Amino acid sequence: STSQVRQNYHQDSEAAINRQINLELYASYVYLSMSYYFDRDDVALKNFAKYFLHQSHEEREHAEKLMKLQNQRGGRIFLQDIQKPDCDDWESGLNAMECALHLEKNVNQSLLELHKLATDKNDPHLCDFIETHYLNEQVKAIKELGDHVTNLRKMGAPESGLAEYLFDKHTLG
Amino acid sequence: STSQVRQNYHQDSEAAINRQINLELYASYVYLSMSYYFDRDDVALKNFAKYFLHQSHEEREHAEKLMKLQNQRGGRIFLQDIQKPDCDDWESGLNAMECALHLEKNVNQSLLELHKLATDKNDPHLCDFIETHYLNEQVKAIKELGDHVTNLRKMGAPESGLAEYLFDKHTLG
Amino acid sequence: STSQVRQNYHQDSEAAINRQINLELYASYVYLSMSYYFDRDDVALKNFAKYFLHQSHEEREHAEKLMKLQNQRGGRIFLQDIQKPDCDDWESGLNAMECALHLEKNVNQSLLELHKLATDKNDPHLCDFIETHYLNEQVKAIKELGDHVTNLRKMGAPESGLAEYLFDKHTLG
Amino acid sequence: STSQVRQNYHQDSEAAINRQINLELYASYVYLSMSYYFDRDDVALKNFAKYFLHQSHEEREHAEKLMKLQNQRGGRIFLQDIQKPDCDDWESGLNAMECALHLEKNVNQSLLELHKLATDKNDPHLCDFIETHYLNEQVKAIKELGDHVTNLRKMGAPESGLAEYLFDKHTLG
Amino acid sequence: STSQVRQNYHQDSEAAINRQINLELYASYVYLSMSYYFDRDDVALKNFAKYFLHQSHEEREHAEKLMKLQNQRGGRIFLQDIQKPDCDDWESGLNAMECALHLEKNVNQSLLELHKLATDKNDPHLCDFIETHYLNEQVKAIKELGDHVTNLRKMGAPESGLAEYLFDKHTLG
Amino acid sequence: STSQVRQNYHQDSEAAINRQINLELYASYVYLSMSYYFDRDDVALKNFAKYFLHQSHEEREHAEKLMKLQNQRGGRIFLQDIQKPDCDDWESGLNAMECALHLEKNVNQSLLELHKLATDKNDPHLCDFIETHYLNEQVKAIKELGDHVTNLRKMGAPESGLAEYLFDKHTLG
Numbered sequence A, B, C, D, E, F: 001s002t003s004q005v006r007q008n009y010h011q012d013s014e015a016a017i018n019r020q021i022n023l024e025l026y027a028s029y030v031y032l033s034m035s036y037y038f039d040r041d042d043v044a045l046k047n048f049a050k051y052f053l054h055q056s057h058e059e060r061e062h063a064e065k066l067m068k069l070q071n072q073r074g075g076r077i078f079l080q081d082i083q084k085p086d087c088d089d090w091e092s093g094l095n096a097m098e099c100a101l102h103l104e105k106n107v108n109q110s111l112l113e114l115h116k117l118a119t120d121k122n123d124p125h126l127c128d129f130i131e132t133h134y135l136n137e138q139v140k141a142i143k144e145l146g147d148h149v150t151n152l153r154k155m156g157a158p159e160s161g162l163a164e165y166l167f168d169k170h171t172l173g
């Protein structure tokens, strides 16, 4: 049953990796939903749409890298349902950015718990995988989203549709 | 409630489009599972893995095009859970190709039902959308997968691991 | 006696580095032996030979990087005899790949023990050195060798000399 | 009061980062002093001057990267006075190199203490930040300075003004 | 004690140059503080941050040129502590620009006093050094900052966060 | 048991080739030791280090060519332990060059004995192999090392650390 390549890879780490794969795919689905919300004719913020679509693809890449990790270590991928996002209607550019920030912080928390598990299981390869490919990415993404939220709020979003328009043009464009 | 752009777009067509979006995302997920099955150290068919990963990305593109359609017509996207694939272990290159063929034919059947609905609702734009972007793509994909299955079987798959190896090299490579 | 550059570098870490240097040089020697086994007129698998020669040179590079590390930290290199490999005759492409896999996993285990020692001695520089330059390299090498072994076995190695021939051509060539 | 981006960032880590920022700015100031010492007409070692000026700019870059880190994590930068260097007159190329070596080892010790704090606070992002951007840089800088000191001493510095002259030309030039 | 190069260089001029060096380094530190204030996630005005970082580096260059002057004339550099800036929190783009304007005018006043001292000591080289490299630079910087302050105020800064946003984009970007 | 390619290849020649392979690998190991001795922070002669590392790689190449010869003639490679070098600490650039000269002359003597054996066994292919690839290489290497030793001694090595420094720069650099 044991993979010929498997070495120093705890069952709990394998399971946590599978959970993280699902979470990354979920985040990719959330961002896809947000993108096409901004593609609606009654919202019509193309650069918001582009931004979130890019994020969706990035999240898919993160999931695929975790799957590659899983196979590299000799764990076995078990996929689960990708739950639909919490919203169909994301209400505003600002609200979407706030939800994205919340999502990214939740993903970061899951990564931190993964790192803690790796450390506890004395899995330095896994620890450094997480550190190299995920943790800084998360910190950067959270910082960027926080900057966006700050700018939108200062501009007067979401009540100032001019605010969101000009943010779409000048920041995301 | 009615979109300012909506014209000649029946509620039943909108719902069928949402169902098709989910089905395309499901197909993407299935192909992703198959790809990383072939990435396992105990399977190790890199070109199978690459082939199915490409298919996964293509299916995601198809889903995104349907979402774009939905917004273009003034329908509203409602996402649903993406169900996990039927298998974790796809057993062989031949079996994966057979399951892919079955999946593609099911997707094609759903597209044909969508076309029939469009026709019944006198939606020529939707009909020609399906015809232009989906139906021929499906016919081609089904033909390609059938060719692959035929070749693998004639080569002696899945019992001939040499068969699958050489197919991976010479057809998919 | 203490090096002017030495800081936070435990004697046990220095000794473990010297042991790792010897182990990497040993691995280089093993791969050299395997390469020239495949260069024999009665074996004559040129791409196996090339593959293992490349591995030999890579292992030498790993040893040299450890020696550089040793000097960077102000430890002192103490070389030991490089023991001859366990075999003169490696029997088959498959057997050589299996022995290489075993060797790489042993090297990985030694690296993991080195990391554990570094961590216990609160040597984050050493830990991150190992993580950055060695651990992922090992995981990748083990995964690659496992893939090779899997393919050879499925093809019918080592009894199918056609198997090894075609693997030599299509995978290693 | 809490930053919207802040996550898993302990107050003690934030304070230690502020201390490190000050220390890096101090090191920059020290190197600036040394550079312009070597620019004096009665010292006139242009390549020493260039070397230390480069080091000064590098140290400022390190400080700026720590400030960026601070903002990325949602900590708040609090700057302090940059103390003047211990010397106005650095006496000789050899003495300046010895003081630089001492400074770099002190900076390294502060970084190691920072890493220990990060580890104790279970801040893997901070740990890997320090490891990636600072610790190896320090090890390299210390090794280089030790090499310089060794060469100068063997050449006969600081009593051999010919020694320092030729070192300036051939090593630093 | 007297430098072999020293000629027509009064002790009072040497001391005033040392004071100016400290003042330029102080200005550099102030601009650095402002830059990283604008890099905060709750301020998030990247082009303000870039503008002030550029100013910081420019001020450092000015200090280094004064040190070079000091050595060229045969005076001796005596560095002092670089005091921390008056603020940690610069409140707004407009407020930062107003403080920068005040700082630049103070630096200009110090330069004018330096020029007056040079003139009184019949040091035409020093006078023309100040005139060529510093005075026009100051006049330009003050004019630019005044223009910025005027624009921000007319736009409605600092109460109009849209004002600061659009200024950041269109003037500083 | 006899190789299909073997012709006019005496068992004694095969054994002598195996001994020469071991000797070349030993020489490679010696040069590696010397290189990293010069990489020490308390020795710090980078061009000595580079010179000996190049020699190490060259010696490995010589060993690999002998192994290739062995297989070409249908002999069988039997590897032995590579003994550690006689020294951990090579004391000086001059001493390392003197030891290298001694090593190269010992290798040359072994090659001459190999040639004599080949001649006695009427193996003109082996004789011309040795002549073409090894003997002139040895003569050149010995001449070069003798030149180096002569220069170092005339310069005042090893007591003149300036001597070794300038030799490192101007001859080996």
Ligand SMILES: [Mg+2]
Pocket: A128, A131, C128, C131, D128, D131
């Ligand atoms: Mg790390």
Ligand SMILES: [Mg+2]
Pocket: E128, E131
């Ligand atoms: Mg003038």
Ligand SMILES: [Mg+2]
Pocket: A166, E166
């Ligand atoms: Mg505008």
Ligand code: NA
Pocket: A024, A027, A058, A059, A062, A107
């Ligand atoms: Na992600």
Ligand code: NA
Pocket: B024, B027, B058, B059, B062, B107
């Ligand atoms: Na599709």
Ligand code: NA
Pocket: C024, C027, C058, C059, C062, C107
């Ligand atoms: Na290795």
Ligand code: NA
Pocket: D024, D027, D058, D059, D062, D107
């Ligand atoms: Na630094």
Ligand code: NA
Pocket: E024, E027, E058, E059, E062, E107
């Ligand atoms: Na200035």
Ligand code: NA
Pocket: F024, F027, F058, F059, F062, F107
């Ligand atoms: Na040789």
